[PDB]
Amino acid sequence: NLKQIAKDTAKTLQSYLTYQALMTVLAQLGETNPPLALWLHTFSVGKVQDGEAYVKELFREQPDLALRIMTVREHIAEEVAEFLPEMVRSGIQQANMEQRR
Amino acid sequence: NLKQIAKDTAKTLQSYLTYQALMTVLAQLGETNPPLALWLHTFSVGKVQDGEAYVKELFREQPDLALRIMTVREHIAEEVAEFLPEMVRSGIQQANMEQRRQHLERMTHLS
Amino acid sequence: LTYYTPDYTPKDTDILAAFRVTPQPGVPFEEAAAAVAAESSTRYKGRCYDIEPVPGEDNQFIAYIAYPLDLFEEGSITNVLTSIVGNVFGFKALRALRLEDIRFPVAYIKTFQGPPHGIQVERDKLNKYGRPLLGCTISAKNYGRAVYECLRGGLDFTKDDENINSAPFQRWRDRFLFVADAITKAQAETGEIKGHYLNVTAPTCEEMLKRAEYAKELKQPIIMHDYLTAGFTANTTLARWCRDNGVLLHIHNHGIHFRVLAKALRLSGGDHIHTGITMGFVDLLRENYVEQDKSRGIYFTQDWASLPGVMAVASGGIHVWHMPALVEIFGDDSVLQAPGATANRVALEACVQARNEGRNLAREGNDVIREAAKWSPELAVACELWKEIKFEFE
Amino acid sequence: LTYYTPDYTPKDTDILAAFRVTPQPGVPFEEAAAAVAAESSTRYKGRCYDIEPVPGEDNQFIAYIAYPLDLFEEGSITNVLTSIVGNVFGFKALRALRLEDIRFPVAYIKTFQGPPHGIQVERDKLNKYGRPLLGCTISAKNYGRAVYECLRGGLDFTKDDENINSAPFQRWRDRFLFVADAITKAQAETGEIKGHYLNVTAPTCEEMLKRAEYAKELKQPIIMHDYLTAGFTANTTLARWCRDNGVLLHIHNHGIHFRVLAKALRLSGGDHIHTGITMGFVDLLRENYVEQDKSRGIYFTQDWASLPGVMAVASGGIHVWHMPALVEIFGDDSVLQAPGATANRVALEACVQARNEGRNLAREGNDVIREAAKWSPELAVACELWKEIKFEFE
Amino acid sequence: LTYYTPDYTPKDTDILAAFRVTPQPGVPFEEAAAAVAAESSTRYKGRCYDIEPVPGEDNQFIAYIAYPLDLFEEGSITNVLTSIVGNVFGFKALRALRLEDIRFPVAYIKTFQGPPHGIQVE
Amino acid sequence: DADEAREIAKAIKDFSRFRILPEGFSNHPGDAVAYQAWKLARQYSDLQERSRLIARGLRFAHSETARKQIEQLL
């Protein structure tokens, strides 16, 4: 229809916003805690963007990174999702022109 | 920074919005021209990413159906993509209620 | 207000600056630029001749200031960097101020002598031609035993970086021998000539004259130090120790952009400095003539007019698997950072021949690393350690 | 995580740093401080022993890091400023990072020799005792004729500042004579001995050795240069030219605070440097012992243990009428910046006797300037030029 | 004959000479000037760009030769006076040859230090 | 010569680095070096400075649509 695709996309959007969390997570612990930099690739094989499935495995060890993965997503989803209406429409004008020419 | 992120997000979901473009055309041509759906399904399997740069390869062999994929970037990108602001943050509050419960599931196991 | 004459073309011989200015609320764009060109200097005055704005950014404008030729001293970078931006960063009428560019004339570039050694002159004692370089950072005997086994994997030199001076556990003299005795046992056993880059930093300079006369007596290769916590004045007493010896070439919102700091450092000296805009100054250190690219930070035009080039150093971190991404961008004429050292030389040497076949090394980079695993066991380990992280969410 | 042991008292002989840290969202306060004490150095490791927070400010916390004694080289400021903050400013896990303080031990302070001349030693050739100083900034003959008439009003010296080197209109040699010939015609005609502070800045140092051997042959007073565009390495070849001659003493969110830069500069050398917290380092350059004032930036405690003091320079601007406000704050032992020069000496000399009567010079400062107009016509002009701006809106 | 390109403007930075030339009988004015700009030096070659004559005098013509900037050593008058007129006075195809002028660029004048003392310093 | 074909090989490099063809240009290297010579000639707002980039701009431009883009500068 026209409405369920907007919840369909919002399920996929939320996944990619969790990606930008984990790339920000991974780019910072590379120098601060390097023992906590080569073990984050034990849980992010094939799908990086999980939210709690790794944490259910991280409860039986130290699960504290998750509450930081969910506080990285705050400052980006509050500063892109409001500015989103022009940011996606502006790239439509590019991909309207490049294909017309 | 954030403009490094936000400009990267601007192309990712766009390529996802040009997929629901191609899927709307996919269900449309399964009813009007079933030869044209069986050939569009042949090209669809080719594992080619970057939806903006995917439609350009369509103009190479078929310059016409690549306009109908582009057509809904004015028409279906208004009923899917302006509804994103009230439909992200609601799910974040849900994930603030889905995963905070399992800090208690371990705590009850610690109880 | 005779410091703003836009009815004027800057001459062939003028010195010529830019500034990415940001003023306080209500401050006009035409009086902040006369607040720069006048308070720098004092026919002997700079004049802001152009006032171009910046699109889609926080209220900046590009101020083009033109100082005369005679205002400055021939052959000095300290004077040029001080009579221009002495007390111009100290105003409260501006929110920010950066110095994006400087055009030196042709007449003033060839007062300077420049880097002692270039893209040509480096290949004399350095036995590496047409392919970039490699070098990794490292008690006193046990410290000498470790560089004894890093150069034995392909490293063209090594780095005594992270500030190792003479401490009470590891003195300055007993570090030089044990990484000179460690070169004499890897020059012949690997078929190439390698250095170990060593710090010369001392309290005085009379002690620094003894940390550089002891190093190369006739003992030892081309051996460097920094520019920070030091100056264009501190490193002029020893960059001109390369005018006798050929021995020290590696230099290791509101600011001054690096391409101003790179014009200051070629003309001072040195053969390969550490660091569209990443492509920007690395087409200033290496090129002869550069035409005006406003989307690259290159706001001016000045031919270098026959003066020795200077290469670049890789500045992103550890890169063991991400090797063909650097080879295209920095090109041939650059420098990059024992099982863990033999994986470095193999991944570098492999890509360079697959470039010269004609294979597009941008869109093919990983498969050239993968075919080089079938004759090298040290690249069998590394490619699994690095990141295959993707998204196919279309 | 052996880089954070809060169960530990830092010794009597440890080197001891602070940091006003600000991390990224979600980053804990206990792992950012182990991201500092470990990546500085490498029993040979610094340990963040305390984690105190900051009240009512953007999420800062004070990290107390304790490096051992033996980790460093005796008598070096370049080593201390580089092995501590080498690659610690280069993280992305922090929003900001400042270096607020350093405690040197008693054992490591007296390895250094310090400033050559102090609060005692300055009064030998300088003929001014118990009252602060005065000095104002200034073709080639016409340039010499202007300092010829600034010192003739009371200026204890003058300043060849704003970067006057040898240009093609005004060479370096023909500026030294005409402001040496201008001292010999104001020493005897005013009854005091005055200098003119001159730049020594050259491209090389071999040329800088000729801009300082020509200045004082036996010709000339105590004559200085800077620290920026120069180092603690550049100004060590000529601050130890004061170890023969007594001739160069004036030094002219995310950073390093000035009180770290002031510990680095007393111990390097010089007799009066240019600049609660304004009162803060000026009780480090001048005092012997300072107890811990957390509301002053003085976070530590270290006695200076008998080493020569160093005075301060006025750093607010032109101050002709605002004279008694500086005399209380910087005290006696400091330095401040021909009709326009005779108004300066009179307003300075007047207040100092009205302090010693017992009159509260804070709550009375303007009337002491007004009573000194009735015997000085140059203070009759100045007090009307400056600002009487008030508000009585109660 | 790539030493005579009159389709060329001498640059802002070129070194730039003149010559009041007088050739033997029958010798053309265009090959005596390529007999000067080529045998001086050896993109590294001087080029006689102009061939102007002299009115009412014995068959002279003014040859404008343009050497590049990089051809010479910074700060030397011996080099400039020798790499230009080394073995160019030694031809028999010319009756005479004089060197009337030299333009130094702005870029090459200020390599030199010059007279120590001037109209001011004296 | 050597140095001019150095930069022509650079100009075709960036013209083929792009994912998108810019307006009025095709796959020929005569369009590649005439795209840079026009892209870096928009920035002058002066007539007697841009003709240094227009004579070279009219020296390489291969298709007629790439000839019109150079003609807008005049």
Residue numbers in the entry:
A (entry chain 3): 2 to 102
B (entry chain 4): 2 to 112
C (entry chain F), D (entry chain E): 23 to 64, 80 to 175, 182 to 295, 307 to 329, 341 to 402, 415 to 471
E (entry chain C): 23 to 64, 80 to 159
F (entry chain N): 122 to 195
Reproduce, without paraphrasing, sentences from the article in which this PDB structure was first reported.
RuBisCO is the most abundant enzyme in nature, catalyzing the fixation of CO2 in photosynthesis. Its common form consists of eight RbcL and eight RbcS subunits, the assembly of which requires a series of chaperones that include RbcX and RuBisCO accumulation factor 1 (Raf1). As the most common form, the form I RuBisCO in plants, eukaryotic algae, and cyanobacteria is a ~530 kDa complex consisting of eight large (RbcL, ~53 kDa) and eight small (RbcS, ~15 kDa) subunits.
To understand how these RuBisCO-specific chaperones function during cyanobacterial RbcL8RbcS8 (L8S8) holoenzyme formation, we solved a 3.3-Å cryo-electron microscopy structure of a 32-subunit RbcL8Raf18RbcX16 (L8F8X16) assembly intermediate from Anabaena sp. PCC 7120. In the L8F8X16 structure, eight RbcL subunits form a core of four antiparallel dimers, which resembles the RbcL8 octameric core seen previously in RuBisCO-chaperone intermediary structures. Similar to the L8F8 structure, each Raf1α domain of Raf1 is docked onto the interface cleft between two neighboring RbcL dimers, embracing the C-terminal TIM-barrel domain of an RbcL subunit. Moreover, similar to the chimeric structure of L8X16 composed of Synechococcus sp. PCC 6301 RbcL and Anabaena sp. CA RbcX13, two RbcX dimers are docked to one RbcL dimer via interacting with the C-terminal peptide of one RbcL subunit and the N-terminal domain of the other subunit. Of note, Raf1α also interacts with one subunit of RbcX dimer (RbcX2) via several hydrogen bonds, including Raf1R140–RbcXK57, Raf1L142–RbcXR102, Raf1P143–RbcXR102 bonds, to further stabilize the complex. In contrast to L8X16, each RbcX2 moves ~2.6 Å towards the equator of RbcL dimer in L8F8X16, forming an interface area of ~1000 Å2 between RbcL and RbcX2 in L8F8X16, compared to that of ~1400 Å2 in L8X16. Moreover, Raf1α in L8F8X16 moves ~3.0 Å away from the RbcL8 core compared to that in L8F8, resulting in a dramatic decrease of RbcL–Raf1α interface from ~1000 Å2 in L8F8 to ~740 Å2 in L8F8X16. As a consequence, L8F8X16 adopts a rather dynamic structure with a more relaxed RbcL8 core that comprises a 25 Å central pore in diameter, which is ~5 Å larger than those in either L8F8, L8X16 or L8S8 structures.
